[PDB]
């Protein structure tokens, strides 16, 4: 009946959802960088 | 939920090199009394009971249990015992009564 | 109750985990594209 | 497996705030929905079925033997939806309070 296991999984879920948000932010920046490079190289 | 945060895991990494030893750093909170057969387990995220540990180490105790400044300790997991798959794992501190007193953010052996 | 509660969180975590995996794979493909383009601005 | 008698499908990662939300689900071959079954929107990490942000009574099927009628839907009105950035999921809770299904999570953005 202990909720320790649930607490442990919340701790993990909280961090993975933060890593997901950061990974998506970085992917958005990588797409911007690609677009800049393609404008420079492909006219 | 301060009862499951009486031990805090410090500086946990997102990735530990496969095949290497892993040092686990933890801090006892002010009033928490560690016992000799407390342990730190490595658990796959999503575990239901403490018996699912992948491996474990008995707690490293400070020799001065009343010193509030000696509360930071570490335990070393040898590579031989560690996972080498891509699953998510966490550290959990389990006391002698089987209560999880702390849980870390997850990491992979990658 | 705590069992359904834990199960429901496992369900959430497993999907956010998959999303992070998909996000890292896109991250890795975006960097491969950047490296390909940056090579075109070394030669 | 008792928590998988209702299967959600086509669950989006994001639901447009201000838009009514269609929730899609199916029943396993044995399961029979009852009039006071409901589907809740729950914040991920909820601890009891009391904690739903909002809910809808299950849509009662008009014939539950057709192969061309397994898909079920219930609609959540936009004005009952979360307006923060937390992750939510659908849970089906039957008359007796048993959770019969839990969805992958989503946000309202």
Curated annotation (Swiss-Prot), chains A, C:
Residues 8-43 form a coiled coil. Signal peptide: none annotated. Ubiquitinated via 'Lys-48'-linked polyubiquitination by TRIM38, leading to its degradation. Widely expressed. Abundant expression seen in the pancreas and testis. It is found in: Cytoplasm. Disulfide bonds: none annotated. Adapter protein which binds TBK1 and IKBKE playing a role in antiviral innate immunity. Activates serine/threonine-protein kinase TBK1 and facilitates its oligomerization. Enhances the phosphorylation of NF-kappa-B p65 subunit RELA by TBK1. Promotes TBK1-induced as well as TNF-alpha or PMA-induced activation of NF-kappa-B. Participates in IFNB promoter activation via TICAM1. Homodimer. Interacts with IKBKE. Interacts with TBK1. Interacts with TICAM1. Interacts with TAX1BP1. Interacts with CALCOCO2. (Microbial infection) Interacts with vaccinia virus protein C6. This is 5-azacytidine-induced protein 2. It comes from Homo sapiens (Human). The chain holds residues 33 to 75 of 392 of the full protein.
Swiss-Prot record, chain B:
It is found in: Cytoplasm, Perinuclear region; Cytoplasm, Cytoskeleton; Cytoplasmic vesicle, Autophagosome membrane. Induction: Treatment with IFNB1/IFN-beta and IFNG/IFN-gamma show an increase in number and size of CALCOCO2-specific dots and partial redistribution to the cytoplasm. IFNG/IFN-gamma increases gene expression only slightly and IFNB does not increase expression. The MYO6-binding domain is required for autophagy-mediated degradation of infecting bacteria such as Salmonella typhimurium, but not for bacteria targeting to autophagosomes. The CLIR (LC3C-interacting region) motif is required for interaction with MAP1LC3C, but dispensable for CALCOCO2-mediated autophagosome maturation. Belongs to the CALCOCO family. Xenophagy-specific receptor required for autophagy-mediated intracellular bacteria degradation. Acts as an effector protein of galectin-sensed membrane damage that restricts the proliferation of infecting pathogens such as Salmonella typhimurium upon entry into the cytosol by targeting LGALS8-associated bacteria for autophagy. Initially orchestrates bacteria targeting to autophagosomes and subsequently ensures pathogen degradation by regulating pathogen-containing autophagosome maturation. Dimer. Part of a complex consisting of CALCOCO2, TAX1BP1 and MYO6. Interacts with MYO6. Interacts with GEMIN4. Interacts with ATG8 family members MAP1LC3A, MAP1LC3B, GABARAP, GABARAPL1 and GABARAPL2. Interacts with ATG8 family member MAP1LC3C. Interacts with LGALS8. Interacts with TOM1; the interaction is indirect and is mediated by MYO6, which acts as a bridge between TOM1 and CALCOCO2. Interacts with AZI2. (Microbial infection) Interacts with Lassa virus protein Z. This is Calcium-binding and coiled-coil domain-containing protein 2. It comes from Homo sapiens. The gene is CALCOCO2. The chain holds residues 17 to 126 of 446 of the full protein.
């Amino acid at each position: 009946e202990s909720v320790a296991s649930h607490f442990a999984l919340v701790t993990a879920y909280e961090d993975i959802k933060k890593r997901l948000k950061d990974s998506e932010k970085e992917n958005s920046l990588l797409k911007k960088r690609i677009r800049f490079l393609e404008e420079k190289l492909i006219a | 939920h301060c009862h499951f945060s009486q031990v805090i895991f410090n500086s946990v990494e997102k990735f530990y090199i496969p095949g290497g030893d892993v040092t686990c750093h933890y801090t006892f909170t002010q009033h928490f009394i560690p016992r000799r057969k407390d342990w730190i387990g490595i658990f796959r995220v999503g575990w239901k009971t403490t018996r699912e540990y992948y491996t474990f180490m008995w707690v490293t105790l400070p020799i001065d249990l009343n010193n509030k400044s000696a509360k930071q300790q570490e335990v070393q997991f040898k590579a031989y015992y560690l996972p080498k798959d891509d699953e998510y794992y966490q550290f959990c501190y389990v006391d002698e009564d089987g209560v999880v007193r702390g849980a870390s953010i997850p990491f992979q052996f990658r």
